[PDB]
Amino acid sequence: YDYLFKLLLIGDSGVGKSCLLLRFADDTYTESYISTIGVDFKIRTIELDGKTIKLQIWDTAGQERFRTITSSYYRGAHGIIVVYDVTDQESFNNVKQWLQEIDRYASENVNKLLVGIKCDLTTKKVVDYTTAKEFADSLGIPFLETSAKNATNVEQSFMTMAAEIKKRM
């Protein structure tokens, strides 16, 4: 490829990471051991301005166990997407803490995005748009609030991030 951009997907279990991962494909490579366990990343290739870009996104296995924000959260990625569940107050409270720290420790040029999602349509909203937007603004980080009903803006956010990363190098 002309480019390989590494994206980190940060979020707890059951908050809607699965919804965001629908914008990516499974890698088709396997061998015996990988077939038994699976992997924690997905991929997508796009052509942008005549160049081929591979996006590789890690929804890192076991991350929910280790919420001390160590370097694995803020080094070795071009973009970091942090997600909470709009139907779960504690999920938002947790993400405020993690994102504050990631923003503090990551290089300024790492692309960051906060996503509030309703991934289960049978659930009831709790976290106001304005509250989450105010938080994102306090850090100077883009914010996307989204529902599984329509993923157009999610798709848009990833395409924007890819173009921004490409430009910065």
Added chain:
Amino acid sequence: ELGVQRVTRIENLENAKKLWDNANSMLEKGNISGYLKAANELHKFMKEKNLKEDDLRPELSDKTISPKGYAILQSLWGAASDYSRAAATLTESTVEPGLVSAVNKMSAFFMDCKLSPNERATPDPDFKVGKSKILVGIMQFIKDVADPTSKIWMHNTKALMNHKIAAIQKLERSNNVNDETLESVLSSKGENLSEYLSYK
């Protein structure tokens, strides 16, 4: 459930518990290689017997992962996360990241058997294991479980693992281990080697 199905399930859960205990014991000993092997045996058995993490968790009520154990799990997690990403390069980004990520997922499975969703580990923040030691442990395990025909770019996978293990050990021998020198090994596809590596 027929009686035979109940008896079989209980027997299988009891055996899976024993395998989990063995993995936890290896972890407690700081035996990186032994832990990865035991975690794999647990995963293989649960798959074979059609048991899920949720089935085994109640059986583990009187068991604990120690702060030391959690520190080792965190070190393995951080190293595997970093390595999977470092190993994704323009040369190749499928086989090496896949193998490393599978190791990470396998360790996560061990924890999921014990912990409910989003329950946090409680690592000893002062218990350090060397990242270079952890990485070699991961590589040794990958060498063991990689298919003999597996390749990373133009090199045999097992042979490239041996090559990277040796490179890390040479860094240790010369007091030259840091995140940068380790990253150079992790991201390498041996593109400058004079011969393509084979295992046998």
